[PDB]
């Protein structure tokens, strides 16, 4: 049964062609998010261990589920005639990073460093599990306002991580790298690092740097807010036009701008309470 194991509440999110409901699990009052996905609207399909053909999103969410809280946890899923239903563990109270930056403006570097660091660990976790998210952006990041813990959500554009070239893409265009714009190909890690550069500019300047293809491929980053030299260098490094010139995750986390990160609880105490 399905409508019997979850108390179902109101729609969640900003308002788009997607369907994610707030819910509570009757078994233990666990907050859940109940995501519906129409079969006719699914890009890539995968096969589970039982050979059961499921949306790739389900495959990817299973590979990253764990006690590491940087990534949304899939707790169960159900198939229905025209759709799949995903039961996700829902933190609360939460606000997504997009609304957070809109309400607060450009973030202090201390806060952006804690947030960026936690995103880095979450993406490293995905990659260690064989999963490429492909839609890293503030809209796909939830802030647990009480614990100060960030959460990567919506794996609906992801793929299995691989070392060869990708020629397809269904993520957010303004976060996609210039090699995707110019040649419709990319490699997964360096494209992720590019989106992390867009994300970090977003955090310290209050909005993304590029809106148009010409800016994305232009190789110029104007800073619209006061930003430290160290942070500017890291951002420009992540947004190197040539993929092989971008830093690895290790190089990002060893960057001098990234030292002395706050802990989640400290982050909540100093910046979210």
């Amino acid at each position: 049964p399905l409508e019997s194991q979850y108390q179902v509440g109101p729609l969640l999110g900003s308002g788009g062609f997607g369907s994610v409901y707030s819910g509570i699990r009757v078994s233990d009052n666990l907050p859940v998010a109940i995501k519906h996905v129409e079969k006719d609207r699914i890009s890539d399909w995968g096969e589970l261990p039982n050979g059961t053909r499921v949306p790739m999103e389900v495959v990817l969410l299973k590979k990253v589920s764990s006690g590491f809280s940087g990534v949304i946890r899939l707790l169960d899923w159900f198939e229905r005639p025209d759709s799949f239903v995903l039961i996700l563990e829902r933190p609360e109270p939460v606000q997504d990073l997009f609304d957070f930056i809109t309400e607060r403006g450009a973030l202090q570097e201390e806060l952006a460093r804690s947030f960026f660091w936690q995103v880095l660990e979450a993406v490293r976790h995905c990659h260690n599990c064989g999963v490429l998210h492909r839609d890293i952006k503030d809209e796909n990041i939830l802030i647990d306002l009480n614990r100060g813990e960030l959460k990567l959500i919506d794996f609906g554009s992801g793929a299995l991580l691989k070392d060869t070239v990708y020629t397809d893409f269904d993520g957010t265009r303004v976060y996609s790298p210039p090699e995707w714009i110019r040649y419709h190909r990319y490699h997964g890690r360096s494209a992720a690092v590019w989106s992390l550069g867009i994300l970090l500019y977003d955090m310290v300047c209050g909005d993304i740097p590029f809106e148009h293809d010409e800016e994305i491929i232009g190789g110029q980053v104007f800073f619209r807010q006061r930003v430290s030299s160290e942070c500017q260098h890291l951002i420009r490094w992540c947004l190197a036009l040539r993929p092989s010139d971008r830093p690895t995750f290790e190089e990002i986390q060893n960057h001098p701008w990234m030292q002395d990160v706050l802990l989640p609880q400290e982050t909540a105490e100093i910046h979210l309470h």
Partner: peptide
Amino acid sequence: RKRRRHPS
């Protein structure tokens, strides 16, 4: 300046 979401 106009800040906006960007669908996938």
